[PDB]
């Protein structure tokens, strides 16, 4: 139904100044239905009180008591499954299932979910109270990314997800990098619970913000520890969280609200796709106080210096007068004023920047030039040690003379990507590694 | 009276078929009074049983929707009557999708006339998006979807539908830019030429060509393809000068394209004479760009940086700050190096440029930077250029072709050809940039 309010109608105004002159007479009309193009599901942007059916919480209490009593995993799973079928039936009658949907899972992991994984032996040692224990602990288990409409017992309320995320930050960050798959899957589940409830309030913003910082921290840990892990999967998931988080900011802004940490995560969006001009126009439309924040100014400062006119990649169009300030890029990375998390994101481009630094320099040398000594390159491109640069030269078939100089005129590749060869292993900067060792993970993620 | 209007629409006359009550109020008011006591089923059956009505269902529903609009229109409330207007408009366009739709030739002027009205109405409604519990730019987005479906319906076989093809494209792109979603214009541009049945692009009306090039170049500039953007901007303004300037609306459109033509031309190292541009631009605007020209002509990086900072807001609105910050410094460096080379090589006969000489001339050009104690907090303006990166500046210039020299990292100097003529050392900017980045021809087809 179309909204029919005197204040709104007066505010919009009439189509014509004086309908009476044209012979029109004031008329009363029926409240017509809302047209199909005007219906929009507004995501919740305000704190909502948590209320649950008294029968629903009593059912969970029975599940908790039943779980303690029963010791056989197969028997416990069957009893819980039968109760779930009855639980879904009454909820359909109650109408709190498929329409506003609110979760009721008070504990970190649903009791039915814990029972299901117990019989499938998919419970990680982190969730178990003791390594020899066979039943997943209620106070340490976490819900798995799910992929029949979900019941209110399966999804957990937003004010629990904040508590759940706090548990991950405090008691599970030190387990990296061995628990990369565990945390990445579990955190992805937390965002899934929010989108089930169609919630985008302060809790969702706060939780989504910290998830991004974990991914940046995880990104540096994996490359530092030289442990094989999925890179594209990690980056795509990080990019999805940024565009989702940026989308929430527009809705809050459009509703007259504000987000205290919008500026910080606008910067990460710029660094997600360094060489994409689309993000340069998006940041310009933003208000002045966001465009002039130090995190945002630092972010697009990098975008300019990374911009190289010789950047060759399939499906990429070069642009005019690109700076290609590789020397300035490494001066910013060493700046004590650089936020650490931004540094972790920018480490993914070190191989690309270094290659185009040498490729650009190679074109400005005559054929009779002596090989460039490694000592000069290390101070220029910030290589951690001589072992790193010699591996870099071997990867791109750069001739190395006497083990201490590089013959840049022998470089043949014009693109940082080799069709046959696997991409070079990602590296890091020892300056950023030193900064990390002076700050706890918990303090870094909270900010 | 109602039957009289149906006869008017059945035979193709569309004098009263309009949504603008200013020129249609008397007719509809009488129509509403006679039709106030009927149901939706009554109106639909009324049209179906009317003689000589075309058998097409698209035309049937359009007539019923207009009658439904007339019956329940509320002149005192644009919002309360909004659903009827948009419902009729979508039916009107749907009647225009089929190439062989009845009375399509006379229906084309109606669609253009109603489109301009509803675009104006949608802009008014989307302004009050907060009070209407609707997302921002929702009414315009809905209309763009309606027009987009119409645009896809146009195919080459002068049919009336083909006549408004370029008119339709300009409307679609203007909506996309207005709803702040300009990347959607890519689909329109890629399919505009195949759908057009004209032998050449210049066969369209000149006013529409200027609008199309203005949007196309504006679209290119967003993707940071300045040379492609410049060609359309330059060509559009050349065509605009032919039109008479007595309209006083050409001039306001003349200064709109100049706001993008001047910064784009400067990026490619082209200065504009202020003679022909005198009527289009105010004296204040002439001085504002003249300051930038002086800074970039004589290699003043700090001056360019300060000018962008001073003009940050209005450049940021036109999606110009980032592009200008990207490209202007490298042109500024070329002029700076051209100045020192002229006074060092061509006059004093020294073809070796020590890095120490360039370093002390860069720190004069750039001045205070992030590392200096003056600028404690990094900004976009004092965080990109530093005098310490002497070799980096030279390396980029040589790779871009703006400078012909060889640099020696170990000797801390760059050597250059020992020639009196500077053109052998520092070639003209525009020739090098255009050579390295060929642009699409200004003649589309």
């Amino acid at each position: 139904y179309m909204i029919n309010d005197a204040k709104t109608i007066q505010l919009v105004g009439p189509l014509i100044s004086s309908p009476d002159n044209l012979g029109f007479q004031k008329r009363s009309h029926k409240a017509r239905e809302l047209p199909r193009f005007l219906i929009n599901q507004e995501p919740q942007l305000e704190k909502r009180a948590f209320v649950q059916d008294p029968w629903d919480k009593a059912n969970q209490e029975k599940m908790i008591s039943l779980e303690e009593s029963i010791d056989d995993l197969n028997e416990l799973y069957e009893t819980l499954k039968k109760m779930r079928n009855t639980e879904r039936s009454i909820m359909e009658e109650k109408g709190l299932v498929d329409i506003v949907f609110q979760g009721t899972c008070l504990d970190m992991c649903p009791t039915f979910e814990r029972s299901r994984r117990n019989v499938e032996y998919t419970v990680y040692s982190y969730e178990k109270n003791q390594p020899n224990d066979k039943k997943a602990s209620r106070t340490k288990a976490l819900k798995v990314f799910a992929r029949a409409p979900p019941l209110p017992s399966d999804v957990r309320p937003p004010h629990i997800l904040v508590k759940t995320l706090d548990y991950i930050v405090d008691n599970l960050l030190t387990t990296l990098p061995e628990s990369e798959g565990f945390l990445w899957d579990r955190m992805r589940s937390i965002r899934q619970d929010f989108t089930y409830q169609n919630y985008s309030g302060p809790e969702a913003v706060d939780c989504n913000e910290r998830i991004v910082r974990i991914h940046l921290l995880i990104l540096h840990i994996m490359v530092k520890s030289n442990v094989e892990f999925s890179l594209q999967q990690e980056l795509e998931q990080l990019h999805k969280s940024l565009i989702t988080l940026s989308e929430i900011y527009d809705d809050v802004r459009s509703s007259g609200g504000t987000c205290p940490n919008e500026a910080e995560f606008r910067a990460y969006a710029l660094l997600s796709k360094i060489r994409d001009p689309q993000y340069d126009e998006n940041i310009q439309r933003l208000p002045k106080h966001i465009f002039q924040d130090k995190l945002v100014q630092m972010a697009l400062c990098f975008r300019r210096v990374i911009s190289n006119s010789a950047y060759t990649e399939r499906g990429f169009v070069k642009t005019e007068n690109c700076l290609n300030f590789y020397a300035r890029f490494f001066q910013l990375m060493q700046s004590p004023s650089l936020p650490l998390l931004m540094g972790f994101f920018l480490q993914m481009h070190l191989t690309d920047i270094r290659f185009y630094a040498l490729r650009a320099l190679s074109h400005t040398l005559n054929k009779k030039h002596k090989p460039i000594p490694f000592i000069y390159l290390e101070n220029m491109l910030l290589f951690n040690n001589r072992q790193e640069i010699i591996e870099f030269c071997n990867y791109y078939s750069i001739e190395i003379i006497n083990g201490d100089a590089a013959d840049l005129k022998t470089l043949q590749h014009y693109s940082h990507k080799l069709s046959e060869t696997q991409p070079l292993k990602k590296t890091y900067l020892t300056c950023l590694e030193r900064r990390l060792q002076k700050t706890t993970y918990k303090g870094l993620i909270n900010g | 009276m109602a039957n009289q209007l149906l006869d008017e629409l059945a035979h193709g006359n569309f004098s009263h078929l309009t949504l603008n009550l200013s020129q249609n109020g008397r007719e509809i008011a009488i129509l509403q009074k006679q039709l106030t006591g009927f149901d939706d089923k009554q109106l639909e059956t009324f049209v179906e049983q009317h003689p000589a009505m075309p058998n097409d269902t698209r035309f049937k529903i359009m007539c019923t929707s207009f009658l439904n609009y007339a019956r329940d229109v509320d002149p005192w409330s644009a919002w309360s009557s909004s659903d009827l207007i948009f419902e009729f408009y979508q039916c009107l366009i749907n009647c225009l999708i089929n190439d062989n739709a009845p009375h399509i030739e006379m229906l084309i002027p109606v669609a253009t006339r109603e489109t301009e009205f509803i675009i104006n109405l949608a802009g008014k409604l989307d302004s009050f998006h907060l009070q209407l519990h609707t997302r921002s730019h929702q009414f315009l987005s809905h209309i763009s979807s309606i027009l987009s479906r119409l645009f896809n319906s146009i195919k080459p076989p002068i049919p009336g539908k083909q006549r408004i093809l370029l008119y339709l494209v300009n409307k679609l792109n203007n909506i996309y830019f207005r709803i702040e979603s300009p990347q959607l214009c890519s689909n329109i541009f890629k399919n505009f030429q195949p759908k057009s049945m004209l032998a050449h692009f210049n066969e369209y009306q000149l006013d529409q060509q200027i609008e199309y090039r203005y949007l196309l170049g504006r679209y290119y500039l967003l993707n940071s393809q300045v040379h492609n953007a410049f060609v359309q901007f330059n060509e559009a303004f050349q065509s605009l000068l032919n039109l008479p300037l007595t309209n006083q609306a050409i001039t306001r459109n003349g200064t709109r394209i100049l706001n993008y033509m001047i910064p784009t031309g400067l990026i490619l190292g082209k200065m504009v004479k202020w003679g022909p541009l005198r009527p289009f631009l105010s004296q204040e605007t002439i001085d504002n760009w003249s300051v930038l020209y002086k800074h970039v002509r004589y290699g003043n990086i700090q001056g360019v940086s300060l000018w962008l900072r001073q003009n940050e807001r209005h450049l940021c609105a036109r999606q110009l700050l980032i592009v200008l910050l990207e490209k202007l410094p490298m042109v500024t460096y070329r002029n700076l190096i051209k100045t020192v080379i002229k006074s060092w090589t061509t006059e004093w006969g020294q073809n070796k440029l020590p890095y120490s000489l360039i370093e002390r001339v860069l720190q004069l050009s750039i001045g205070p930077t992030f590392e200096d104690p003056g600028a404690q907090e990094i900004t976009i303006y004092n965080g990109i250029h530093s005098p310490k990166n002497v070799e980096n500046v030279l390396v980029t210039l040589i790779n871009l072709g703006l400078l012909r020299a060889n640099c020696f990292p170990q000797l801390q100097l760059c050597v250059v050809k020992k020639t009196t003529m500077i053109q052998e050392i520092v070639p003209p900017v525009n020739e090098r940039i255009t050579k390295m980045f060929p642009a699409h021809s200004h003649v589309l087809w």
Partner: peptide
């Protein structure tokens, strides 16, 4: 030390 275009 002489210039040599590439």
């Amino acid at each position: 030390l002489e210039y040599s275009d590439n």
